[PDB]
């Protein structure tokens, strides 16, 4: 059933599972036409499919050509997402296929369940957690590969860099969701935090800066301040 | 006109015959029902005065044999039986009519209600849903489970309705997932009508039988079957025009006949609001939408 604060450690057990977030699959820029009407222009999108235990991120880039000539794009995007996740599962060896897929939005349940009828043993689950995966496009290297794609493409990342060498997957996921929550609440501030000190760099094969354990504690504290702050500037407290 | 005689009425019981019903007191001199119209299936049904639990009854067609009711004090119910000796039966019935010991099937001449509720229902198809092949009539009660209910526990006592599952490999063609889920015409027309039911008359027959078992016995499994058959048609963009017109008439008479006070349990709010107001056929059921809106505006 649904995933929530009570069964949170289940994410880091040894049953293969994936989160699927579809919030960046269909993206549009709304603009005025010469006649003074409004139109949309689609831009490249991505499916965010993440193993929370290992950090493996299957980033399926959604090129705008997939929308050409199609109607009801908002509804098509959920079935396109489900088709691509299904194709991903089918491409994995049996022993790498997930036992559970957790969708971040309840509207993905039926599209994914229907595309996975062939996999009766894979549980499709919602969640009550408000996960900040929409902010994935605030990670510069992920945004860059999506916007440069000229065709459909799958790119594989580890969203934890090398963190699992030093911390558990529970702690790595907590760090990831704090970073992403901050980027979602105030992208400018969050990004200022992560890069202010020019001596801390991002390795070519990484997404985030190479912080020492001590510097991550500083960083993490500065993100909780930001999130609390913005919650002030928002609600006035 | 045919007759279903009763050996006796040893226990107080409300007896239904199709959409009619009457009370019989314990050991009252009741010996059955006469003037039953030939040409239709019928249902004779029972609710004991001491235990409203278990409504039960028998589907039958008098063209198929001579049937009577006899109370069984061991199993505690009124049982339908067949009399093979035609002259014995005629002689029994004639004696009971001469002594005026039978109620008359009370059909008003203007009234087509029973025809309109059973137009496509045939005994041969009832007997495939209700498997008990040594009898020409079929027993149904409030508690019997459907085959689909048994998949989600006695198989001999099940209602074998056609399995309707919208998220099933039968319903959804590989590669047409979105198309087939959002527009069920493939499942309705190819899988169910051409493949399983063969024609729409057989589809409507099962739909009508499911409704009648829901209404007369409060059979929950039959209610699901009825709502599912309706929803499969309303959720199909492509339906023969004659089928939509006939469905409108079928449902109209079902909604007309439904007890006003059972609407809360016998009508599924989601299915009806979807069918009448969101589905492909939202504008194709004029008679049904008008009676629903005037009789059950709360549900909507
Ligand atoms: C801009 O994307 C949309 C537009 C309208 C409705 C939904 C969506 C979406 N991505 O789900
Ligand atoms: C006929 O539909 C059913 C059959 C058995 C159990 C459940 C259902 C249903 N409506 O979900």
PDB file of N, CA, C and O in Angstrom, chain B residues 3-9 15 22 24 27-34 92-104:
ATOM      1  N   UNK B   3     -49.149 -22.594 -13.608  1.00  0.00           N
ATOM      2  CA  UNK B   3     -49.379 -22.633 -12.169  1.00  0.00           C
ATOM      3  C   UNK B   3     -48.174 -23.243 -11.481  1.00  0.00           C
ATOM      4  O   UNK B   3     -47.588 -24.204 -11.990  1.00  0.00           O
ATOM      5  N   UNK B   4     -47.787 -22.667 -10.343  1.00  0.00           N
ATOM      6  CA  UNK B   4     -46.823 -23.257  -9.439  1.00  0.00           C
ATOM      7  C   UNK B   4     -47.523 -23.544  -8.125  1.00  0.00           C
ATOM      8  O   UNK B   4     -47.717 -22.655  -7.287  1.00  0.00           O
ATOM      9  N   UNK B   5     -47.973 -24.775  -7.920  1.00  0.00           N
ATOM     10  CA  UNK B   5     -48.661 -25.130  -6.678  1.00  0.00           C
ATOM     11  C   UNK B   5     -47.677 -25.306  -5.521  1.00  0.00           C
ATOM     12  O   UNK B   5     -46.478 -25.541  -5.711  1.00  0.00           O
ATOM     13  N   UNK B   6     -48.207 -25.150  -4.316  1.00  0.00           N
ATOM     14  CA  UNK B   6     -47.453 -25.366  -3.084  1.00  0.00           C
ATOM     15  C   UNK B   6     -48.069 -26.544  -2.347  1.00  0.00           C
ATOM     16  O   UNK B   6     -49.290 -26.590  -2.171  1.00  0.00           O
ATOM     17  N   UNK B   7     -47.230 -27.459  -1.862  1.00  0.00           N
ATOM     18  CA  UNK B   7     -47.745 -28.504  -0.982  1.00  0.00           C
ATOM     19  C   UNK B   7     -48.449 -27.899   0.222  1.00  0.00           C
ATOM     20  O   UNK B   7     -49.556 -28.336   0.602  1.00  0.00           O
ATOM     21  N   UNK B   8     -47.851 -26.887   0.826  1.00  0.00           N
ATOM     22  CA  UNK B   8     -48.366 -26.249   2.024  1.00  0.00           C
ATOM     23  C   UNK B   8     -47.459 -25.070   2.348  1.00  0.00           C
ATOM     24  O   UNK B   8     -46.404 -24.889   1.734  1.00  0.00           O
ATOM     25  N   UNK B   9     -47.863 -24.298   3.363  1.00  0.00           N
ATOM     26  CA  UNK B   9     -47.066 -23.178   3.871  1.00  0.00           C
ATOM     27  C   UNK B   9     -46.870 -23.307   5.370  1.00  0.00           C
ATOM     28  O   UNK B   9     -47.476 -22.567   6.159  1.00  0.00           O
ATOM     29  N   UNK B  15     -43.670 -14.122   0.195  1.00  0.00           N
ATOM     30  CA  UNK B  15     -43.430 -14.760  -1.097  1.00  0.00           C
ATOM     31  C   UNK B  15     -43.444 -13.693  -2.178  1.00  0.00           C
ATOM     32  O   UNK B  15     -44.359 -12.869  -2.230  1.00  0.00           O
ATOM     33  N   UNK B  22     -46.357 -11.103  -1.458  1.00  0.00           N
ATOM     34  CA  UNK B  22     -47.496 -11.208  -0.555  1.00  0.00           C
ATOM     35  C   UNK B  22     -47.056 -12.015   0.649  1.00  0.00           C
ATOM     36  O   UNK B  22     -46.099 -12.792   0.567  1.00  0.00           O
ATOM     37  N   UNK B  24     -47.685 -14.756   3.676  1.00  0.00           N
ATOM     38  CA  UNK B  24     -48.401 -15.978   4.014  1.00  0.00           C
ATOM     39  C   UNK B  24     -48.154 -16.252   5.490  1.00  0.00           C
ATOM     40  O   UNK B  24     -47.009 -16.245   5.939  1.00  0.00           O
ATOM     41  N   UNK B  27     -48.854 -21.816   8.567  1.00  0.00           N
ATOM     42  CA  UNK B  27     -49.904 -22.811   8.367  1.00  0.00           C
ATOM     43  C   UNK B  27     -51.187 -22.222   7.771  1.00  0.00           C
ATOM     44  O   UNK B  27     -52.281 -22.750   7.980  1.00  0.00           O
ATOM     45  N   UNK B  28     -51.073 -21.152   6.985  1.00  0.00           N
ATOM     46  CA  UNK B  28     -52.239 -20.630   6.272  1.00  0.00           C
ATOM     47  C   UNK B  28     -52.530 -21.501   5.050  1.00  0.00           C
ATOM     48  O   UNK B  28     -51.612 -22.069   4.453  1.00  0.00           O
ATOM     49  N   UNK B  29     -53.818 -21.641   4.674  1.00  0.00           N
ATOM     50  CA  UNK B  29     -54.187 -22.557   3.579  1.00  0.00           C
ATOM     51  C   UNK B  29     -53.833 -22.058   2.187  1.00  0.00           C
ATOM     52  O   UNK B  29     -54.689 -21.792   1.336  1.00  0.00           O
ATOM     53  N   UNK B  30     -52.545 -21.980   1.929  1.00  0.00           N
ATOM     54  CA  UNK B  30     -52.019 -21.439   0.692  1.00  0.00           C
ATOM     55  C   UNK B  30     -51.532 -22.577  -0.178  1.00  0.00           C
ATOM     56  O   UNK B  30     -50.743 -23.400   0.279  1.00  0.00           O
ATOM     57  N   UNK B  31     -51.990 -22.639  -1.432  1.00  0.00           N
ATOM     58  CA  UNK B  31     -51.499 -23.726  -2.274  1.00  0.00           C
ATOM     59  C   UNK B  31     -50.975 -23.262  -3.627  1.00  0.00           C
ATOM     60  O   UNK B  31     -50.800 -24.088  -4.529  1.00  0.00           O
ATOM     61  N   UNK B  32     -50.570 -22.004  -3.729  1.00  0.00           N
ATOM     62  CA  UNK B  32     -49.693 -21.637  -4.815  1.00  0.00           C
ATOM     63  C   UNK B  32     -50.183 -20.436  -5.613  1.00  0.00           C
ATOM     64  O   UNK B  32     -50.994 -19.628  -5.142  1.00  0.00           O
ATOM     65  N   UNK B  33     -49.597 -20.323  -6.786  1.00  0.00           N
ATOM     66  CA  UNK B  33     -49.723 -19.167  -7.664  1.00  0.00           C
ATOM     67  C   UNK B  33     -50.192 -19.628  -9.026  1.00  0.00           C
ATOM     68  O   UNK B  33     -49.569 -20.490  -9.655  1.00  0.00           O
ATOM     69  N   UNK B  34     -51.278 -19.030  -9.491  1.00  0.00           N
ATOM     70  CA  UNK B  34     -51.844 -19.391 -10.777  1.00  0.00           C
ATOM     71  C   UNK B  34     -51.773 -18.188 -11.715  1.00  0.00           C
ATOM     72  O   UNK B  34     -51.438 -17.070 -11.307  1.00  0.00           O
ATOM     73  N   UNK B  92     -53.725 -32.382  -9.321  1.00  0.00           N
ATOM     74  CA  UNK B  92     -53.457 -31.605  -8.121  1.00  0.00           C
ATOM     75  C   UNK B  92     -53.829 -30.143  -8.341  1.00  0.00           C
ATOM     76  O   UNK B  92     -54.539 -29.535  -7.536  1.00  0.00           O
ATOM     77  N   UNK B  93     -53.359 -29.553  -9.437  1.00  0.00           N
ATOM     78  CA  UNK B  93     -53.624 -28.138  -9.669  1.00  0.00           C
ATOM     79  C   UNK B  93     -55.127 -27.886  -9.758  1.00  0.00           C
ATOM     80  O   UNK B  93     -55.667 -26.998  -9.086  1.00  0.00           O
ATOM     81  N   UNK B  94     -55.828 -28.675 -10.579  1.00  0.00           N
ATOM     82  CA  UNK B  94     -57.268 -28.467 -10.744  1.00  0.00           C
ATOM     83  C   UNK B  94     -58.015 -28.522  -9.404  1.00  0.00           C
ATOM     84  O   UNK B  94     -58.911 -27.705  -9.157  1.00  0.00           O
ATOM     85  N   UNK B  95     -57.680 -29.476  -8.526  1.00  0.00           N
ATOM     86  CA  UNK B  95     -58.299 -29.508  -7.194  1.00  0.00           C
ATOM     87  C   UNK B  95     -58.040 -28.205  -6.429  1.00  0.00           C
ATOM     88  O   UNK B  95     -58.950 -27.665  -5.791  1.00  0.00           O
ATOM     89  N   UNK B  96     -56.815 -27.659  -6.511  1.00  0.00           N
ATOM     90  CA  UNK B  96     -56.480 -26.457  -5.745  1.00  0.00           C
ATOM     91  C   UNK B  96     -57.184 -25.218  -6.298  1.00  0.00           C
ATOM     92  O   UNK B  96     -57.556 -24.311  -5.541  1.00  0.00           O
ATOM     93  N   UNK B  97     -57.331 -25.136  -7.625  1.00  0.00           N
ATOM     94  CA  UNK B  97     -58.084 -24.029  -8.213  1.00  0.00           C
ATOM     95  C   UNK B  97     -59.569 -24.117  -7.863  1.00  0.00           C
ATOM     96  O   UNK B  97     -60.200 -23.094  -7.578  1.00  0.00           O
ATOM     97  N   UNK B  98     -60.142 -25.327  -7.893  1.00  0.00           N
ATOM     98  CA  UNK B  98     -61.555 -25.485  -7.548  1.00  0.00           C
ATOM     99  C   UNK B  98     -61.826 -25.012  -6.123  1.00  0.00           C
ATOM    100  O   UNK B  98     -62.858 -24.388  -5.849  1.00  0.00           O
ATOM    101  N   UNK B  99     -60.907 -25.272  -5.203  1.00  0.00           N
ATOM    102  CA  UNK B  99     -61.041 -24.809  -3.828  1.00  0.00           C
ATOM    103  C   UNK B  99     -60.507 -23.391  -3.626  1.00  0.00           C
ATOM    104  O   UNK B  99     -60.492 -22.902  -2.484  1.00  0.00           O
ATOM    105  N   UNK B 100     -60.097 -22.726  -4.713  1.00  0.00           N
ATOM    106  CA  UNK B 100     -59.626 -21.334  -4.708  1.00  0.00           C
ATOM    107  C   UNK B 100     -58.526 -21.106  -3.669  1.00  0.00           C
ATOM    108  O   UNK B 100     -58.509 -20.105  -2.946  1.00  0.00           O
ATOM    109  N   UNK B 101     -57.567 -22.022  -3.637  1.00  0.00           N
ATOM    110  CA  UNK B 101     -56.477 -21.953  -2.668  1.00  0.00           C
ATOM    111  C   UNK B 101     -55.223 -21.287  -3.231  1.00  0.00           C
ATOM    112  O   UNK B 101     -54.157 -21.397  -2.607  1.00  0.00           O
ATOM    113  N   UNK B 102     -55.312 -20.601  -4.371  1.00  0.00           N
ATOM    114  CA  UNK B 102     -54.142 -20.013  -5.005  1.00  0.00           C
ATOM    115  C   UNK B 102     -54.327 -18.523  -5.245  1.00  0.00           C
ATOM    116  O   UNK B 102     -55.432 -18.044  -5.480  1.00  0.00           O
ATOM    117  N   UNK B 103     -53.236 -17.796  -5.153  1.00  0.00           N
ATOM    118  CA  UNK B 103     -53.185 -16.392  -5.530  1.00  0.00           C
ATOM    119  C   UNK B 103     -52.969 -16.312  -7.030  1.00  0.00           C
ATOM    120  O   UNK B 103     -52.358 -17.194  -7.671  1.00  0.00           O
ATOM    121  N   UNK B 104     -53.490 -15.244  -7.632  1.00  0.00           N
ATOM    122  CA  UNK B 104     -53.395 -15.041  -9.055  1.00  0.00           C
ATOM    123  C   UNK B 104     -52.246 -14.088  -9.348  1.00  0.00           C
ATOM    124  O   UNK B 104     -52.140 -13.018  -8.732  1.00  0.00           O
TER     125      UNK B 104
END
